[PDB]
Amino acid sequence: VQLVESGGGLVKPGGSLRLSCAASGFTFRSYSMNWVRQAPGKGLEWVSSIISSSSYIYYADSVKGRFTISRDNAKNSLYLQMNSLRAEDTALYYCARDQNAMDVWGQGTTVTVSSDSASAPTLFPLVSVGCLAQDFLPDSITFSWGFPSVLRGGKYAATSQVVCKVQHPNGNKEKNVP
Amino acid sequence: YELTQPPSVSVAPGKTARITCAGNNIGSKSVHWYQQKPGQAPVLVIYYDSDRPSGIPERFSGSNSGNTATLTISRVEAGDEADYYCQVWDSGSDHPWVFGGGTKLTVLRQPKAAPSVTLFPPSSEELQANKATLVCLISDFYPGAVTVAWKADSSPVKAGVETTTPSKQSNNKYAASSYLSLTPEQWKSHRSYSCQVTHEGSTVEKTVAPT
């Protein structure tokens, strides 16, 4: 039993974006499915829901006339088409099942609504050993071979500490460290 | 319909934490509670007022009566540190779900730990990129509240300082980093740059210099 979200990334205001949620481990058609989001540093907010068998659709008042939920039982997938995106829509979107109480959640996928352009990280090795990635957007960086990212001039930077490889949607970077 | 929660609850380990969810005649509704540890997906820890889903320890319990629903956590551990959200479901409305504003549970009085500070000078590959970035890495400290003072020579510096907010690691200790952005000339000009992290009223001294 699992839920895996995807399709999230960086988008400009007024743009459109489709979110996908993949269900596995249970009979997808027997459960109601939901979309719940969470703005950075804020609380959970229900967005939309689709019911089982009958497929009645519901939305929050802040997303109606713009967001569209749907499902594909043959592919065990839940969708969320998002149109006319604004700054207020920037959040981490969770896929969650069942009505009344949401028993299963996915780890979610991040949606960033911004006028700023996307860019891959720039790696610099550090010596006193460290690794310094700068000038990437959105903040979706992972470090392989842990510190939180900081915001400088509209772009993010992150440092790792222990051959330094990173994972970023715009580009994977590798760098050598003595 | 409005569900109100206190924004913060803080208790020591082994003690009882009570998270409340205020609502008009909420005792007549079913109340569910979600636990969300930092970075993780939310977890249903209590459902239908007082029942525990499979896998949840018995020290989690809930109740619901009148205009107040309560989540009680007995024998609190450091691992219980999370944001807790209450939620109800209203069938015949166009907005079935209603979530509470959330309550941050902080676990006090864990073993105190001085910060492990590391200060990296600007990389020689970065100076050839016409940039100069100092990196002050702060690790393994508790409680998770520090203040960072960047000093040039022996004088405060406020411009070009970008300090992050501490985030909790897997070992229930905190890590933070501070960046001081300088021009390559601001760097070679001064005889020293210092990162004096203060934790619980105790500075950890570390100076860097271009020479």
Author numbering:
A (entry chain H): 2 to 129, 142 to 158, 171 to 187, 203 to 218
B (entry chain L): 2 to 212
Extract from the study:
Signalling initiated by antigen binding to B-cell receptor (BcR) immunoglobulins (IGs) is of paramount importance throughout the natural history of the disease. Recently, a cell-autonomous model of CLL cell activation was demonstrated whereby BcR IGs from both stereotyped and non-stereotyped CLL cases could promote Ca2+ influx and nuclear factor-κB target gene transcription without the addition of exogenous antigen. We demonstrate that BcR IGs derived from both indolent and aggressive CLL cases interact homotypically via their combining sites, binding to distinct internal epitopes in each subset of patients. These unexpected BcR–BcR interactions are sufficient to initiate intracellular Ca2+ influx, and mediate stronger affinities and long half-lives for the receptors derived from anergic B cells from indolent clinical cases, while weaker and short-lived for the aggressive ones.
Two symmetry-related molecules in the P11475 crystals interact through the VL CDR1 and VL CDR2 loops and a composite region spanning the FR1 and linker region between the VL and CL domains of the light chain. Charge–charge interactions are established between residues Arg110L in the VL–CL linker region and Asp50L in the VL CDR2 loop. Residue Lys16L in the FR1 region of the λ-chain protrudes between the VL CDR1 and VL CDR2 loop, establishing a salt bridge with Asp52L, and an interaction with the helix dipole of VL CDR1. The characteristically short VH CDR3 allows a close approach between the two receptors, but establishes only one direct hydrogen bond with the epitope through residue Asn101H. Computational calculations of the binding energy also suggest a weak interaction, and indeed dimeric species of the P11475 Fab could be detected in SV AUC experiments only at a protein concentration of 20 μM. Since the high absorbance of more concentrated P11475 solutions prevented the measurement of KD, we resorted to dilution isothermal titration calorimetry to obtain a dissociation constant of 430±160 μM. The most recurrent SHM in the light chain of subset no. 2 CLL cases (Ser93LGly, numbering according to the deposited P11475 structure) is positioned at the tip of the VL CDR3 loop with its Cα atom in contact with the opposite receptor, allowing a closer approach of the BcRs for homotypic interactions. The most striking finding stemming from the structural analysis of the subset no. 2 IgM is the crucial role in self-recognition of the unexpected Arg110L residue in the epitope, corresponding to the splice site between the IGLJ3 and IGLC genes.
